[PDB]
């Protein structure tokens, strides 16, 4: 029964999905005797948080009740009270979180200051849901870095393209409507200048109601990206590059002028983790990598990701000479070669999904 | 009814399973007066039929009854009356075949024997069940070529080997045991020699009686073939290789004074269509090829493959330069690359296992 | 879209059950530029509307908004502002209503409001759970009669005791347990003297998660109660009696002193559809029917019910002369009963619980 | 798991004797030889080979250091030929697993105990419930000297057999009835009281596709009221065994039993259940399919004579005091002496539900 209740404010965070940017889903139900009186989910971005609503709604009824929270009630004090406050004075006399903040700095405070003003508290009903529910902006706030998934299409034999770079006809319609749906959950899409010269790609969410648009980022050393290319042209959606100081001044304006915005990094050669880095400071909690087989070659090898996704079409393209999955150096010997588990087996049209996770 | 007998008929027949060698599986069902009678299967090889079990049980019974078989039944006219007649001289008036004998040139001389004797033949109950039965055997008499089976061990990027050849472990030990079966249910197992000096494989079939070893076969160019490898010494299984006029004559003769069955092809490079067509004027029906990514290319590109199984591991191993699953020639537009169609995936240990099949 | 929209209305819905008693289940969802930015359900009696809760979670966002609404938004003037006021004054662009309300005269009352205010107004989305969401307040609002339950408990040869009147132990305290939650749903407790003089029963919702009990109606012909009963003393909960002209006058009187309230029929006999109409007129919207298998067979005769649930326990009474589960006159040919239809079949302990409703 | 594979097998190889083995209890057998299977058996015929006769045979020279599954208890006794315990011994098996001993406790074991004094390892209990399942008429009549009996009626939801007029035409569905006929095949025998041969006058024959060997139609007298009119009588189609009594008229008692009818006679004015089953056990009947009469039921209910209860309800309400009920005679006075029961399944049929319940 307490789940009943925590399994609804669960539900309820998951309505404001895309909605509060960088923030994260929050659920609350406050019950008082035995009905529920008040429910809430964070909706907008900094806008009121869950329990804000809930104890509204709740009205006279907060009094002598019970709260359940997916997670971590605030506790710093911002423009308006904290959270954990609101929940002292209203007269909730117990509450049920699902989870403690992220932050090692604020972790357990919100929960300290409640049990300071008398209310009982009771935690970890529900944690592994109300883990998956923010995963990404969990992971975010643990390291510091976004979190990560890498995704490609391949043949069975793990082409991703025929030895004369024909990749026409790899991916069913099926799959790759079924990637699209990644394009929603993060925050920015990313891949090397190579997938703009050879695909030129609009990299653009065209799911069903597809609001807000993620962030384009592309990896061009030389800034040799065609000046044309949908990307740069079609006003879509932001689109970042990352390039070395071997860039063009002039050419960096003109696009500068087209809205794009340009990071020259200080190294010879782009080092994904200073671009990680960068795109968390400016609040990207989330990469969506799709290509280059030498792109995936960085992540991996740097160990900088957190789930991979590759589909598989029931066909052979023969190759020595044809491109496979991933690139760059690799590792030389098994024993260095770290382990993944799979996570899932989808089959998605004619073709399968696999997906993995590390450690 | 009618598809009922059949049925176990042809659940009969499957108990003779890996029993009956060379020879096809088959049921038997007498019926009498609506009721079963007889019973019967191949069970091993060189023995008694279906049908000679099935009307011995049957008795008395088997005058003026029905018989189910799933395979027609034979009719040369031997060192014993063939089953064909056995029906006849035993007072069956119908027989429901579910299909004709793969023969080309005996298919339909059992039907015919038959029929002109007063018996009622008719044919095609579930005669989709019985293909299945003998999978392989069947496409030995239809085409006149043994059915080959691809398989190959990866990490989930399509690497069999890190850059450096080393090929330590990628997929897991549950894996090469579910691997091995397969060298139960091939006549012949097949290599090319850059499997052999690497591993020095047995190539046996080392699961529980196997009452009989396949024979091993290694495509051997130049018949570099080392000559202490287990293939050519420790005796254990039959063991052909196939080369071109570059091999060493006293080489040749040597390894064939141990046993060694050596053809030799007229052609620069080994021609997969040829080694097929000799195998099966040996009476190899089935071969089960697992090495060399080449072998793999050659296997494909020739569109030589009646099954191909590939078990992915939950490891990244990159590189450019390193192996992938198969190499040589290829497909140079995905307008010529086959479609095939994923027939199964299951999951073996913490390893994938995906099969598939042509058109 | 506007189905998921609707279908979250419906499941905010829910979380009023049984929390709202007489008034109806409603959800509401404000949408604002494909953004979820309000949610209500109507959770207590005599409060805040599902349409106040949402709107007022909106705020500003509510302005040129959409709303989906489970129940058309009511046009009640008076104590405050009709929901079709305030879904106008805020702004909102246009509204979904899932069905009307099935109060005859105010239906297409509160869709015209807003229509006349400029808002257009969508009708029809699911329907279907919209109509389940409020089975019983629904029907009663349509017929003006209340909502119907008949319940009994028998042993598999469908006797409710043994021919000596001993019913001991005929369902199992699971049954027992499961029939107790019926006592909740229903705005009424429906009886024969019968029972009172038999059991002498509380016919109070024993539940822990009660707050209001239900009314306790006893048919009572010629009012021959015992006057010390349960259910005129205990006055734990409402008691009506429906009588006839041969009530003793001073018996009436001496009833209700007590607070009993005592309906006197102008018929000689008492007809169950005028004693559904009067409980009708008193605001009475359900009706859970219990006791006498006379009672029963009333109800079914006049085809005054609207579901029937039978608990089937695993025993064998027998007896020419034992009771049956409908008493009373009965069908004289099969021509004329009434077909029914099983609406669930769900196992209660080592008891069935069958449950079937008309045509 | 290979072992209990083995089993499976032979249960199923049993199976296709369901058919036709009359009194016979279905069994299967196979023998396998260095891991392969070289022979399967089944009791087909009533009468004729066993199983494991089948089985070994067809094994032939395979037979000798092999292994054998049987899912019964070989038979031990001594006849026209060798028992099977024996067979297996001479054919040189060297171990047997079987899933169930026999019924018959004056026979159960002896096979088990001449095949161990010949060093045959027994593995006993591999998939004994099944073995249980495959021929459990049988094995209750072994275990009893008693038929199995099945109890099944029609009635509205409300328990009701027939209006307060006695009109039952649209009671339960064409589907229901179609299901009820199944079991008139796993029966050997179906009771019907005379008030029933009366009402409806029916066939009591077996209709389902492929019947052989038709079920003995047994009528429960008193007055030998049984209309001379038709059917049970002269519609030669199968056997009609009729118990009467005193009250008996001579006369038409002979007059009947002119064409193939029985009639068997009880010294008491009750025609006492428990009497006529054990009557019909000893006429080599195994199982019972009584399917009419309130008060026929009641009987069998109160003597606490069935293995099996199957009621069809129609989603109908007949009501009514004095409509008749599902179960009428006697019964139970006191709630404490009545047996509680046990639902086994619930299905649902057209538009009906079938319940079918079993003791304890
Ligand atoms: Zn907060
Ligand atoms: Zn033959
Ligand atoms: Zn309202
Ligand atoms: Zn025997």
Chains 1, 2, 3 share one sequence.
Not at 314 to 323: D, E, W, Y
Request: glycine share 8%.
């Amino acid at each position: 029964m307490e789940e009943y209740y925590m399994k609804l404010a669960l539900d309820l965070a998951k309505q404001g999905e895309g909605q509060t940017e960088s923030n994260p889903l929050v659920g609350a139900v406050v019950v008082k005797d035995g009905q529920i009186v008040g429910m809430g989910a964070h909706l907008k971005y900094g806008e009121a948080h869950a329990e804000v609503h809930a104890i509204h709604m709740a009205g006279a009824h907060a009094e002598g009740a019970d709260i359940y929270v997916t997670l971590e009630p605030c506790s710093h004090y911002g423009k308006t009270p904290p959270c954990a406050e609101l929940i002292i004075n209203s007269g909730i006399k117990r509450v049920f979180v699902a989870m403690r903040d992220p932050n090692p700095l604020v972790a357990g405070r919100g929960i300290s200051m409640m049990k300071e003003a008398g209310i009982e508290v009771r935690e970890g009903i529900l944690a592994d849901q109300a883990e998956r529910l923010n995963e990404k902006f969990l992971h975010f706030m643990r390291t510091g870095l976004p979190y990560v998934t890498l995704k490609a299409a391949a043949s069975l034999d793990g082409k991703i393209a025929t030895s004369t770079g024909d990749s026409k006809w790899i991916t069913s319609e099926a799959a790759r409507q079924d990637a699209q749906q990644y394009r929603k959950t993060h925050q920015s899409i990313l891949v090397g200048v190579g997938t703009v010269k050879a695909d030129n790609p609009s990299l653009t969410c065209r799911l069903p109601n597809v609001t807000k648009q993620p962030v384009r980022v592309i990896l061009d050393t030389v800034l040799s990206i065609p000046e044309d290319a949908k990307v740069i042209c079609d006003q879509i959606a932001p689109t970042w590059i990352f390039t070395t100081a071997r860039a063009d001044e002039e050419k960096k304006k003109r696009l500068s002028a087209f809205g794009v915005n340009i990071f020259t990094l200080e190294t010879e050669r782009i080092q994904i983790p200073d671009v990680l880095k960068i795109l968390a400071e400016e609040g990207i909690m989330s990469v969506y990598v799709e290509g280059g087989s030498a792109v995936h070659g960085s992540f991996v090898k740097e160990g900088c990701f957190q789930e991979i996704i590759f589909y598989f079409a029931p066909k052979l393209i023969g190759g020595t000479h044809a491109p496979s999955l991933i690139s760059g150096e690799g590792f030389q010997s098994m024993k260095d070669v770290p382990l993944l588990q799979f996570t899932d087996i989808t089959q998605i049209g004619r073709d399968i999904k696999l997906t993995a996770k590390p450690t």
